[PDB]
Design an enzyme around this catalytic site. Structure first.
Site, PDB file in Angstrom:
ATOM      1  N   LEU A   1      52.304  95.031  17.104  1.00 34.27           N
ATOM      2  CA  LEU A   1      53.587  95.338  16.487  1.00 34.27           C
ATOM      3  C   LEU A   1      53.547  94.863  15.043  1.00 34.27           C
ATOM      4  O   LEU A   1      53.159  93.725  14.768  1.00 34.27           O
ATOM      5  CB  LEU A   1      54.745  94.695  17.260  1.00 34.27           C
ATOM      6  CG  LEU A   1      54.934  95.165  18.708  1.00 34.27           C
ATOM      7  CD1 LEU A   1      56.126  94.490  19.345  1.00 34.27           C
ATOM      8  CD2 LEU A   1      55.075  96.676  18.785  1.00 34.27           C
TER       9      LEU A   1
ATOM     10  N   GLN B   1      54.090  90.905  11.650  1.00 33.57           N
ATOM     11  CA  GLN B   1      53.202  90.375  12.696  1.00 33.57           C
ATOM     12  C   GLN B   1      53.796  89.203  13.478  1.00 33.57           C
ATOM     13  O   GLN B   1      54.119  88.162  12.917  1.00 33.57           O
ATOM     14  CB  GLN B   1      51.818  90.022  12.141  1.00 33.57           C
ATOM     15  CG  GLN B   1      51.158  91.154  11.350  1.00 33.57           C
ATOM     16  CD  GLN B   1      50.621  92.270  12.230  1.00 33.57           C
ATOM     17  OE1 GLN B   1      50.945  92.362  13.413  1.00 33.57           O
ATOM     18  NE2 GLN B   1      49.791  93.124  11.649  1.00 33.57           N
TER      19      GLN B   1
ATOM     20  N   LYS C   1      53.263  90.615  24.658  1.00 30.85           N
ATOM     21  CA  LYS C   1      52.789  89.393  24.028  1.00 30.85           C
ATOM     22  C   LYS C   1      51.583  88.831  24.799  1.00 30.85           C
ATOM     23  O   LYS C   1      51.680  88.533  25.997  1.00 30.85           O
ATOM     24  CB  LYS C   1      53.928  88.371  23.957  1.00 30.85           C
ATOM     25  CG  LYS C   1      53.597  87.093  23.224  1.00 30.85           C
ATOM     26  CD  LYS C   1      54.844  86.351  22.796  1.00 30.85           C
ATOM     27  CE  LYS C   1      54.472  85.142  21.964  1.00 30.85           C
ATOM     28  NZ  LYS C   1      55.643  84.636  21.181  1.00 30.85           N
TER      29      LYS C   1
ATOM     30  N   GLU D   1      60.614  94.985  27.433  1.00 29.38           N
ATOM     31  CA  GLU D   1      61.073  96.272  26.886  1.00 29.38           C
ATOM     32  C   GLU D   1      60.711  96.418  25.408  1.00 29.38           C
ATOM     33  O   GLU D   1      60.548  95.431  24.696  1.00 29.38           O
ATOM     34  CB  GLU D   1      62.580  96.394  27.041  1.00 29.38           C
ATOM     35  CG  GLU D   1      63.351  95.225  26.421  1.00 29.38           C
ATOM     36  CD  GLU D   1      64.844  95.428  26.507  1.00 29.38           C
ATOM     37  OE1 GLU D   1      65.589  94.436  26.345  1.00 29.38           O
ATOM     38  OE2 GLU D   1      65.268  96.577  26.754  1.00 29.38           O
ATOM     39  N   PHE D   2      60.587  97.657  24.957  1.00 25.18           N
ATOM     40  CA  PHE D   2      60.286  97.935  23.564  1.00 25.18           C
ATOM     41  C   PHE D   2      61.543  98.415  22.849  1.00 25.18           C
ATOM     42  O   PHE D   2      62.149  99.421  23.218  1.00 25.18           O
ATOM     43  CB  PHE D   2      59.148  98.960  23.450  1.00 25.18           C
ATOM     44  CG  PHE D   2      58.837  99.364  22.041  1.00 25.18           C
ATOM     45  CD1 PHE D   2      57.997  98.586  21.249  1.00 25.18           C
ATOM     46  CD2 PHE D   2      59.391 100.527  21.498  1.00 25.18           C
ATOM     47  CE1 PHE D   2      57.722  98.952  19.949  1.00 25.18           C
ATOM     48  CE2 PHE D   2      59.116 100.899  20.196  1.00 25.18           C
ATOM     49  CZ  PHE D   2      58.281 100.109  19.417  1.00 25.18           C
TER      50      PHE D   2
ATOM     51  N   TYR E   1      63.654 100.018  17.035  1.00 23.09           N
ATOM     52  CA  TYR E   1      63.802  99.809  15.601  1.00 23.09           C
ATOM     53  C   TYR E   1      63.367  98.435  15.088  1.00 23.09           C
ATOM     54  O   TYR E   1      63.799  98.019  14.020  1.00 23.09           O
ATOM     55  CB  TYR E   1      65.249 100.082  15.199  1.00 23.09           C
ATOM     56  CG  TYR E   1      65.649 101.522  15.358  1.00 23.09           C
ATOM     57  CD1 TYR E   1      66.215 101.984  16.545  1.00 23.09           C
ATOM     58  CD2 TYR E   1      65.463 102.421  14.326  1.00 23.09           C
ATOM     59  CE1 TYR E   1      66.578 103.308  16.697  1.00 23.09           C
ATOM     60  CE2 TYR E   1      65.831 103.739  14.465  1.00 23.09           C
ATOM     61  CZ  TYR E   1      66.385 104.183  15.657  1.00 23.09           C
ATOM     62  OH  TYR E   1      66.739 105.510  15.781  1.00 23.09           O
TER      63      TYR E   1
ATOM     64  N   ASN F   1      62.833  94.333  14.479  1.00 25.52           N
ATOM     65  CA  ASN F   1      63.759  93.220  14.187  1.00 25.52           C
ATOM     66  C   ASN F   1      64.972  93.570  13.313  1.00 25.52           C
ATOM     67  O   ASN F   1      64.902  94.481  12.473  1.00 25.52           O
ATOM     68  CB  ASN F   1      63.006  91.992  13.628  1.00 25.52           C
ATOM     69  CG  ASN F   1      62.656  92.121  12.142  1.00 25.52           C
ATOM     70  OD1 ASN F   1      61.621  92.673  11.783  1.00 25.52           O
ATOM     71  ND2 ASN F   1      63.512  91.583  11.280  1.00 25.52           N
TER      72      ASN F   1
ATOM     73  N   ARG G   1      65.845  87.714  12.050  1.00 24.87           N
ATOM     74  CA  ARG G   1      64.421  87.930  12.360  1.00 24.87           C
ATOM     75  C   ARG G   1      64.085  87.878  13.861  1.00 24.87           C
ATOM     76  O   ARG G   1      63.083  88.457  14.299  1.00 24.87           O
ATOM     77  CB  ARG G   1      63.562  86.918  11.589  1.00 24.87           C
ATOM     78  CG  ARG G   1      63.847  85.471  11.975  1.00 24.87           C
ATOM     79  CD  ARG G   1      63.043  84.466  11.201  1.00 24.87           C
ATOM     80  NE  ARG G   1      63.485  83.124  11.542  1.00 24.87           N
ATOM     81  CZ  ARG G   1      64.501  82.499  10.960  1.00 24.87           C
ATOM     82  NH1 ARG G   1      65.180  83.089   9.981  1.00 24.87           N
ATOM     83  NH2 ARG G   1      64.843  81.280  11.365  1.00 24.87           N
TER      84      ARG G   1
ATOM     85  N   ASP H   1      63.385  85.884  20.886  1.00 26.42           N
ATOM     86  CA  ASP H   1      62.755  84.699  20.303  1.00 26.42           C
ATOM     87  C   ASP H   1      61.250  84.901  20.224  1.00 26.42           C
ATOM     88  O   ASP H   1      60.550  84.857  21.248  1.00 26.42           O
ATOM     89  CB  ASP H   1      63.084  83.454  21.129  1.00 26.42           C
ATOM     90  CG  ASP H   1      62.648  82.172  20.460  1.00 26.42           C
ATOM     91  OD1 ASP H   1      61.789  82.226  19.557  1.00 26.42           O
ATOM     92  OD2 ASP H   1      63.157  81.104  20.851  1.00 26.42           O
TER      93      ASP H   1
HETATM   94  C1  LIG Z   1      56.555  90.915  23.827  1.00 22.77           C
HETATM   95  C2  LIG Z   1      57.563  89.804  23.989  1.00 22.77           C
HETATM   96  C3  LIG Z   1      57.369  88.831  24.971  1.00 22.77           C
HETATM   97  C4  LIG Z   1      58.298  87.806  25.115  1.00 22.77           C
HETATM   98  C5  LIG Z   1      59.426  87.749  24.292  1.00 22.77           C
HETATM   99  N1  LIG Z   1      60.316  86.736  24.457  1.00 22.77           N
HETATM  100  C6  LIG Z   1      61.441  86.540  23.756  1.00 22.77           C
HETATM  101  O1  LIG Z   1      61.793  87.280  22.853  1.00 22.77           O
HETATM  102  C7  LIG Z   1      62.281  85.341  24.141  1.00 22.77           C
HETATM  103  C8  LIG Z   1      61.639  84.172  24.556  1.00 22.77           C
HETATM  104  C9  LIG Z   1      62.380  83.056  24.924  1.00 22.77           C
HETATM  105  C10 LIG Z   1      63.772  83.113  24.882  1.00 22.77           C
HETATM  106  C11 LIG Z   1      64.437  84.269  24.473  1.00 22.77           C
HETATM  107  C12 LIG Z   1      65.952  84.302  24.438  1.00 22.77           C
HETATM  108  F1  LIG Z   1      66.451  83.113  24.760  1.00 22.77           F
HETATM  109  F2  LIG Z   1      66.347  84.578  23.210  1.00 22.77           F
HETATM  110  F3  LIG Z   1      66.420  85.228  25.277  1.00 22.77           F
HETATM  111  C13 LIG Z   1      63.681  85.390  24.108  1.00 22.77           C
HETATM  112  C14 LIG Z   1      59.614  88.720  23.310  1.00 22.77           C
HETATM  113  C15 LIG Z   1      58.690  89.746  23.172  1.00 22.77           C
HETATM  114  N2  LIG Z   1      58.874  90.707  22.166  1.00 22.77           N
HETATM  115  C16 LIG Z   1      59.457  91.834  22.191  1.00 22.77           C
HETATM  116  C17 LIG Z   1      59.797  92.893  21.606  1.00 22.77           C
HETATM  117  C18 LIG Z   1      60.502  94.010  22.035  1.00 22.77           C
HETATM  118  N3  LIG Z   1      60.695  94.991  21.136  1.00 22.77           N
HETATM  119  C19 LIG Z   1      60.219  94.868  19.864  1.00 22.77           C
HETATM  120  N4  LIG Z   1      60.433  95.853  18.966  1.00 22.77           N
HETATM  121  N5  LIG Z   1      59.533  93.780  19.451  1.00 22.77           N
HETATM  122  C20 LIG Z   1      59.308  92.771  20.311  1.00 22.77           C
HETATM  123  N6  LIG Z   1      58.592  91.569  19.976  1.00 22.77           N
HETATM  124  C21 LIG Z   1      58.070  91.404  18.621  1.00 22.77           C
HETATM  125  C22 LIG Z   1      58.373  90.535  20.949  1.00 22.77           C
HETATM  126  O2  LIG Z   1      57.745  89.481  20.715  1.00 22.77           O
END
Ligand SMILES: Cc1ccc(NC(=O)c2cccc(C(F)(F)F)c2)cc1-n1cc2cnc(N)nc2[n+](C)c1=O
Length: 274
Positions: free
Chosen positions: A23, A27, A46, A91-92, A95, A97, A142, A156
């Protein structure tokens, strides 16, 4: 694996997801655009293969994501923490961040009422986390995502590890987003729901300014001293005075004075006429 000790419904076969490439959005590390073949579904995956003090922290992240579920929280789909190259499947969001989006968007489309709707969605995610006794710790544009129809999820991405620049400043191996961090988190290292509220007010200013950096032109070193003298960011151009008054509420020096996300959310619900 069903009939086995310590079952997990979140465990999936790494074989079911194709990984495209990383993504782009400044980065996020080893985070790829994927496709879950069977379902013709684009996902975010991730991974981890460069950190190793992370491994254990990578799995705490996974566990945390299992316990949370809201329409405005990025949605966990599955994990692969069985064999070496660990996945966290999410999920993806179409758009990327929320910071870049606001910066690059059409402002005719993301008009006054969209900005407020995006704000109502985040307060919703945070009322939920609040109800759950979850401290987010890094609430910022962000760390939000934008789906179809101005849908905003709170997420996050672990960006104090990613940082390349002046958003996270060094602070004992702990990296802090000073301009989003509340005074008590800055001076005494106390994080709580109320320190998320302060971050929320900053994020609300990020949204109203369409993604401008907080405290424009002022350096990090003098942010706290200014706040101590009761200096807050001024009302962005074009921002409602009721949105600003709520910003200032979240920015109260005493944490016990800051609104709950419950009462922030209802304010957005009430405000949501027109
Ligand atoms: C791949 C992934 C794996 C784990 C996470 N985890 C979190 O975002 C997260 C982790 C801990 C706590 C929280 C919360 F408290 F905010 F819900 C959220 C995000 C992602 N993630 C997801 C995306 C989904 N869509 C898009 N466009 N980008 C994403 N990115 C950059 C991610 O890292």
């Amino acid at each position: 694996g069903a009939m086995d000790p310590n079952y997990d419904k979140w465990e999936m076969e790494r074989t079911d997801i194709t990984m495209k490439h990383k993504l782009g959005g400044g980065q996020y590390g080893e985070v790829y655009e994927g496709v879950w073949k069977k379902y013709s579904l684009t996902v975010a995956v991730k991974t981890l293969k460069e950190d190793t003090m992370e491994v254990e922290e990578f799995l705490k992240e996974a566990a945390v994501m299992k316990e949370i579920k809201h329409p405005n929280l990025v949605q966990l789909l599955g994990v692969c923490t069985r064999e070496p190259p660990f996945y966290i499947i999410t999920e993806f969001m179409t758009y990327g961040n929320l910071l870049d989006y606001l910066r690059e968007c059409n402002r005719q489309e993301v008009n006054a009422v969209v900005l407020l709707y995006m704000a109502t969605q985040i307060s919703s995610a945070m009322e939920y986390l609040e109800k759950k006794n979850f401290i987010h710790r890094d609430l910022a544009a962000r760390n939000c995502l934008v789906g179809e129809n101005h849908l905003v999820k709170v997420a996050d991405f672990g960006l104090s590890r990613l940082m390349t620049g002046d958003t996270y400043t060094a602070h004992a191996g702990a990296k802090f987003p000073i301009k989003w961090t509340a005074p008590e988190s800055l001076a005494y290292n106390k994080f709580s729901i109320k320190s998320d509220v302060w971050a929320f007010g900053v994020l609300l200013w990020e949204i109203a300014t369409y993604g401008m950096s907080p405290y424009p032109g002022i350096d990090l070193s003098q942010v706290y001293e200014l706040l101590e003298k009761d200096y807050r960011m001024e009302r962005p151009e074009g921002c409602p005075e009721k949105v600003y008054e709520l910003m200032r509420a979240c920015w109260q020096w005493n944490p016990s004075d800051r609104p709950s996300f419950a009462e922030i959310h209802q304010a957005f619900e009430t405000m949501f006429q027109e």
